[PDB]
């Protein structure tokens, strides 16, 4: 497989400060293409990537309506959830959801997703079969019983196997110049003396897309997983990502270290070393 479409929805209650804010952002891999925010002066589904803009007026209308209705559904869900947990009307709470599909290079469904988390803890998820649910506790079991009764999984499955895979295929075609393009990382190794005894070797990967990457340091061909400092892959702001991995090495031993870089935009993985 090679592509995924996903929607990240966050509904957060704020007693005393209005109705729960609902925001939904849509992504194709690591490219956000839409956002809907109930807090926008005029909430509507809005392009966040050039290739979705060409979509017609009815596209925006239909999705805007789907999002306004989801805002309401998630508000009622937060009410229900407060009750399931015997929580007061005074506290603030968050209901999050992620839904979407993964398709192979040929565009065939690899797998579908539809899961929720309440206050940061997993709550309920549609299983990979796209037919049953896994509830995390007794409150989620209530949601499960209701979903089973209304045959909700069938609806999500039909969306995940049809509509989601079809839109993803259309998006991929309309934005093939970027969505289908992997940008390899630009790599280099820097060296920062810590003392007369040790120095840090930092291996950089910049300008890469998608975010998926693996940077590792080896001393004498042995992975230094426990001794490597790895920062979380971060966005540069231009669609690309950055990441570094560092290792503290004894002065004079820098050549025994090699940095290994794996990225899909690289034909063969790279091996680099500090080059004075």
């Amino acid at each position: 497989g090679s592509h995924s479409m996903r929607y990240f929805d966050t509904a957060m209650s704020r007693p005393g400060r209005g109705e729960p804010r609902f925001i939904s952002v849509g992504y194709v891999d690591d490219t956000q293409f839409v956002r809907f925010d109930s807090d926008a002066a005029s909430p509507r589904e809005e392009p966040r990537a050039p290739w979705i803009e060409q979509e017609g007026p009815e596209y925006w209308d239909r999705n805007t309506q789907i999002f306004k209705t989801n805002t309401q559904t998630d508000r009622e869900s937060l009410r229900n959830l407060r009750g399931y947990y015997n929580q007061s009307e005074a506290g603030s709470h968050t209901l999050q959801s992620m839904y979407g599909c993964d398709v192979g290079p040929d565009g065939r469904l690899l797998r579908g997703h539809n899961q929720y988390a309440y206050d940061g803890k997993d709550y309920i998820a549609l299983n990979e079969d796209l037919r049953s649910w896994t509830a995390a506790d007794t409150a989620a079991q209530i949601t499960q019983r209701k979903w089973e009764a209304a045959r909700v999984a069938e609806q999500d499955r039909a969306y995940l196997e049809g509509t989601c895979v079809e839109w993803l295929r259309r998006y991929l075609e309309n934005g093939k110049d970027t969505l289908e393009r992997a940008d390899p990382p630009k790599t280099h190794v820097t060296h920062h003396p810590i003392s007369d005894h040790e120095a840090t070797l930092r291996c950089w990967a910049l300008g890469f897309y998608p975010a998926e990457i693996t940077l590792t340091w080896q001393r004498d061909g042995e992975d230094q997983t426990q001794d490597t400092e790895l920062v979380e892959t971060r966005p540069a702001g231009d669609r690309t990502f950055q990441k570094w991995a560092a290792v503290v090495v004894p002065s004079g031993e820098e050549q025994r270290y090699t940095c290994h870089v794996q990225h899909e935009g690289l034909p063969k993985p790279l091996t680099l070393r500090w080059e004075p």
């Binding site: 589904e45 999705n63 989801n70 559904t73 229900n80 969306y159």
Partner: peptide, 8 residues
Amino acid sequence: GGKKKYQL
């Protein structure tokens, strides 16, 4: 394209 969500 978005999905119709159901009440939990």
